[PDB]
A paper describes a structure:
First, the MCM helicase is loaded onto duplex DNA as an inactive double hexamer. Activation occurs after the recruitment of a set of firing factors that assemble two Cdc45–MCM–GINS (CMG) holo-helicases. Here we use cryo-electron microscopy to image ATP-dependent CMG assembly on a chromatinized origin, reconstituted in vitro with purified yeast proteins. Our results explain how ATP binding nucleates origin DNA melting by the CMG and maintains replisome stability at initiation.
To understand the conformational transitions that occur upon CMG formation, we determined the cryo-electron microscopy (cryo-EM) structure of a dCMGE complex assembled on chromatinized ARS1 DNA. Both C2 symmetry and asymmetric refinement yielded a structure with limited resolution. However, symmetry expansion approaches revealed that the two rings in the dimer are identical. By overlaying two copies of the CMGE monomer to the lower-resolution dimer, we can therefore obtain a high-resolution view of the entire dCMGE assembly. While in the double hexamer the tight homo-dimerization interface is formed by the packing between six MCM zinc-finger domains (ZnFs; degenerate in Mcm3), the transition to dCMGE involves the loss of several trans-ring interactions and a one-subunit register shift for the remaining tethering elements. The residual inter-ring contacts involve the Mcm6 ZnF that transitions from an Mcm6–Mcm6–2 to a Mcm6–Mcm4–6 interaction. As a result, the two CMG particles in the dCMGE complex become splayed open, pivoting around Mcm6 and creating a large cavity that exposes 1.5 turns of duplex DNA. The intervening DNA appears to stabilize the dCMGE dimer interface. In fact, although CMGE formation disrupts the double hexamer interface, we found that the complex maintains a two-fold symmetric character, by forming a CMG dimer that is stabilized by both protein–protein interactions and DNA gripping. In fact, when CMGE–SCFDia2 is superposed to our dCMGE structure, an extensive steric clash can be identified between the E3 ligase engaged to one ring and the Mcm3 subunit from the opposed ring in the CMG dimer.
Numbering used by the authors:
A (entry chain J): 1 to 58, 68 to 146, 159 to 194
B (entry chain K): 53 to 294
C (entry chain P): 2 to 37, 48 to 200
D (entry chain O): 1 to 208
E (entry chain M): 2 to 94
The structure:
């Protein structure tokens, strides 16, 4: 609920599938069809700042939210099998924010049990890669930091900076 | 009171609590006044000795202040004043930043009739002037830039009924590091909250209602805990933010 | 305050400040006893500094001791835990109990670094041996911290004897991970 | 659709934040985005016209109410989204300006001598005005009850009484309390830290 | 800024620079140059009679000298123009 947060604003503009449950004229720029009015039982991808509200006001609301592609059974199975190796960036750049949003709109205890485990298992690798300060006298870090969500990069940067400052102060001669 | 060491201890504990806390802590009105008066007198004192040493030197080409038992005391005065001024400066600027972050929330608190929290206690007078001036300047900027081209239905910078709440409030469940000091002064039997445990020193008890559990904090241990369940202990100096 | 992060975490220099705001023992090389200019400090008790006699043990705040040792008017005595015997006892205690932290003072790393930098002559043991022992302790403490990081949740954690610098270098990761876990749990209620 | 342009603006803000985040030294804000902002202004004006038209077309009673409610909600939501994007961009730029204003020891910034961190023409006119009143607010703070403490002073703790400094730029003799410093270029000084904090902050001295 | 005192006693700037430094360099403004400091000796010596132990007079003089430098853009270093700005100050009154 951060009004001025940039990342929340960006993540809140993603497109979700949905179906119109009524028949209404005057629309159509949603379909990029200006003059054509929208019919009943039409499936379109609408942005989240619109689909969230259109599914509340009606009783039956005007629009029904359809299951997303990023929360399918395949993605859950891939998360469960191997959390660290999975490329969450390819799935979506804002996986976690949309995950808590989806849990909030629709109370789903199963998703809350999977996302928590995924985050907990990826935190260990994040700490391992953040603590590795190079000494002057690997492919793993470059490979892993390309699989990081938008939220996880902030934590990586903070941890890395703190470790470097601590090491710098310890060995200042 | 009437101890200059305890004033410095209290200032340090207030600064340490201020940096790590999410909310805007109450202002220690008396302590700041005493410290500012002490600084004002001390600066005059060092100035007085400096002038006295300088004036006599030029009169009859006399010797400078004889080096033994002379330089080190005054050097210590200067460095001690420098450290104290730094501590107070950091405290003030940190609380000013926190004031900047929560302008609308403070305004709503002040505008509410049935609110025990009042800005005359939580905010210093200079901080009140800062808040009032900054709010007006920011409102002028946003009104001239964007809000003028908007429908009358939505022209308010504070809207609690819109799609997203425009008033941000402090995070009341932030995770913090705490140390259990125990009683502020002593008399462990006097404190009613203290309760003994098995083969151990007395431990405080708190409850987490969302989790619905009871957590015991033993004295002398460091904990990572929610901020809300520990507000009373921190207010009563039983725990200290590290 | 605002610039260069500093919003919710202390810098190493501020930790050093807090450490130097703590007392230490010295052997004065000068006598400033009153006869039968004075210090008159405002944040620390000046009774010991005013009444000083040579070749006797007194205690003052740390930064005054460093300022005096900058001149030739002081000699700081290192704490008793800065010895090879007392460090080897703690190493053994650290080895035997793999699920608790040893009881070291909350400023051992900062104090060790400061004393090695400033008062190198005052130590009785060779300094390289102590410097090796400090690293030996730090590595094992790091192993225990790495093992303990696995038990992160939404309720609370207990880190009984972790040092100040160790807490500072780990705070941003721990706090944010538990905060995100707490939001995920709260959302499902 | 309607708000798809404003997202671009938000994206730009993100990039600026990175320059703010990855900043070893102070940086300058990029160019203003008055053209994109004017485009959102035009589209929100068109949305206002559409809302008006819906108002008349409903109040003549040719259309069902349930039908009109949907487009009313859509227009309202699009305007709210555009307002959110514009306000977020403005607040980020305002925060960076406040940080710079604090990090120049108060003063009037662009009118007087500046540290050359920022060009005049990057900022908008309203931003230029805002900066002026914010600097005046800092100034009359510094003359408040906290005169003895320099609220615009250094924020790194003092831990070294005597320091070695080197002059970067040539200058003349400067009087200090109880003495004089002669700023001959390529010369080294061994002096107390308190005397030279001001000169180090203004770029006439190096090292600490 | 006033006249009619006993006579303009001459004193060295060494006994004048601490007050000017504390008022200007520390709080607001800076760079009191040596030549500028010598220039600022004459006008304060014009009314020198029974001063350096007095109350507001010197502080108000330094305040008024700061007023020009807030008003005019000027610069940092104080040069032989220091009398030129006091001419402007007496023009103002």
């Amino acid at each position: 609920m951060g009004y001025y947060d940039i990342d929340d604003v960006l993540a809140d503009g993603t497109e979700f599938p949905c179906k119109f449950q009524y028949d209404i004229p005057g629309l159509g720029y949603l379909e990029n069809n200006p003059g054509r009015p929208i019919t009943k039982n039409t499936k379109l991808s609408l942005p989240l700042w619109l689909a969230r509200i259109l599914a509340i006001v009606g009783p039956v609301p005007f629009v029904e939210l359809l299951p997303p592609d990023m929360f399918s059974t395949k993605v859950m199975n891939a998360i469960k099998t191997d959390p660290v190796a999975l490329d969450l960036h390819s799935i979506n750049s804002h996986f976690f924010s949309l995950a808590i949003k989806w849990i909030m709109l629709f109370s789903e205890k199963e998703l809350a049990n999977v996302v928590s485990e995924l985050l907990l298992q990826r935190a260990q690798e994040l700490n391992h890669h953040a603590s590795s300060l190079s000494i002057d006298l690997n492919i793993a870090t470059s490979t892993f930091l390309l699989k990081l969500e938008e939220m996880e990069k902030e934590i990586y940067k903070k941890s890395h900076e703190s470790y470097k400052d601590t090491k710098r102060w310890m060995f200042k001669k | 009171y009437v101890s200059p060491q305890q004033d410095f201890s209290d200032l340090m504990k207030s600064w340490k609590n201020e940096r790590c806390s999410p909310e805007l802590l109450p202002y220690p009105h008396q302590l700041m006044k005493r410290l500012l008066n002490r600084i004002s007198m001390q600066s005059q004192l060092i100035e007085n000795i400096s002038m006295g040493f300088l004036d006599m030197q030029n009169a009859s080409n006399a010797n400078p202040p004889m080096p033994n038992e002379s330089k080190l005391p005054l050097l210590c005065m200067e460095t001690e004043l420098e450290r104290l001024k730094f501590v107070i400066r950091s405290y003030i600027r940190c609380r000013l930043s926190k004031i900047d972050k929560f302008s609308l929330y403070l305004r709503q608190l002040n505008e509410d009739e049935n609110s025990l929290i009042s800005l005359t206690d939580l905010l210093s007078k200079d901080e009140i002037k800062y808040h009032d001036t900054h709010s007006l300047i920011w409102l002028k900027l946003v009104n001239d830039s964007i809000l003028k081209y908007m429908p009358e239905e939505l022209q308010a910078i504070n809207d609690t009924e819109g799609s997203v709440n425009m008033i941000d409030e402090p995070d009341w469940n932030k995770f913090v590091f705490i140390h259990v000091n125990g009683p502020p002064d002593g008399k462990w039997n006097e404190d009613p909250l203290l309760q003994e445990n098995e083969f151990g020193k007395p431990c405080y008890t708190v409850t987490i209602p969302d989790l619905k559990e009871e957590v015991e904090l033993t004295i002398g241990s460091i904990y990572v805990m929610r901020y809300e369940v520990i507000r009373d202990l921190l207010r009563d100096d039983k725990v200290a933010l590290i | 305050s605002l610039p260069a992060h500093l919003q919710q975490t202390f810098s190493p220099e501020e930790i050093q400040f807090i450490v130097e705001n703590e007392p230490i023992k010295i052997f004065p090389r000068i006598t400033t006893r009153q006869k039968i200019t004075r210090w008159q400090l405002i944040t620390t008790d000046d009774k010991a500094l005013n009444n000083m006699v040579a070749m006797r043990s007194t205690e003052v705040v740390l930064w005054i001791a460093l300022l005096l040792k900058q001149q030739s008017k002081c000699s700081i005595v290192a704490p008793q835990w800065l010895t090879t015997k007392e460090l080897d006892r703690k190493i053994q205690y650290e080895k035997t109990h793999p699920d608790r932290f040893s009881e070291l003072p909350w400023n051992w790393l900062v104090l060790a670094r400061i004393l090695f930098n400033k008062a190198k002559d005052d130590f009785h043991d060779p300094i390289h041996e102590l410097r090796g022992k400090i690293q030996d302790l730090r590595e094992i403490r790091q192993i225990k911290v790495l093992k303990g990081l696995k038990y992160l949740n939404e309720s609370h954690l207990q880190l009984d004897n972790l040092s100040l610098l160790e807490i500072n270098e780990l705070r941003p990761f721990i706090t944010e991970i538990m905060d995100k876990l707490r939001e995920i749990h709260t959302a499902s209620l | 659709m309607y708000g798809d342009l404003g997202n671009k603006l938000v994206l730009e803000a993100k990039r600026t934040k990175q320059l703010y985040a990855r900043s070893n030294q102070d940086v300058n804000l990029p160019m203003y985005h008055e053209d994109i902002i004017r485009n959102i202004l035009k589209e929100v004006s068109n949305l206002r016209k559409n809302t008006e038209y819906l108002k008349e077309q409903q109040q003549l009673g040719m259309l069902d109410d349930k039908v009109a409610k949907c487009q009313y909600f859509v227009t309202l939501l699009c305007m709210e989204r555009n307002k959110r994007c514009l306000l977020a961009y403005q607040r980020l730029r305002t925060d960076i300006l406040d940080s710079m204003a604090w990090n120049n020891n108060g003063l009037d910034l662009m009118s007087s001598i500046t540290f050359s961190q920022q060009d005049t023409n990057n900022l908008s006119h309203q931003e230029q005005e805002y900066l002026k009143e914010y600097c005046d607010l800092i100034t009359d703070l510094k003359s408040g009850d906290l005169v003895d403490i320099d609220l615009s002073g250094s924020l790194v703790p003092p831990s070294d009484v005597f320091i070695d400094v080197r002059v970067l730029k040539d200058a003349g003799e400067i009087q200090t309390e109880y003495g004089v410093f002669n700023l001959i270029k390529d010369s080294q000084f061994f002096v107390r830290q308190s005397d030279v904090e001001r000169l180090i902050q203004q770029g006439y001295l190096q090292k600490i | 800024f006033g006249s009619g005192n006993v006579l303009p006693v001459k004193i060295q700037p060494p006994l004048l620079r601490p007050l000017a430094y504390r008022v200007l360099s520390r709080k607001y403004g800076l760079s009191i140059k040596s030549d500028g400091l010598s220039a600022l000796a004459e006008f304060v010596g014009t009314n020198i009679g029974a001063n350096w132990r007095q109350g507001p007079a010197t502080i108000k003089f330094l305040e008024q000298f700061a007023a020009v430098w807030k008003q005019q853009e000027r610069g940092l270093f104080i040069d032989q123009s220091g009398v030129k700005e006091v001419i402007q100050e007496m023009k103002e009154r």
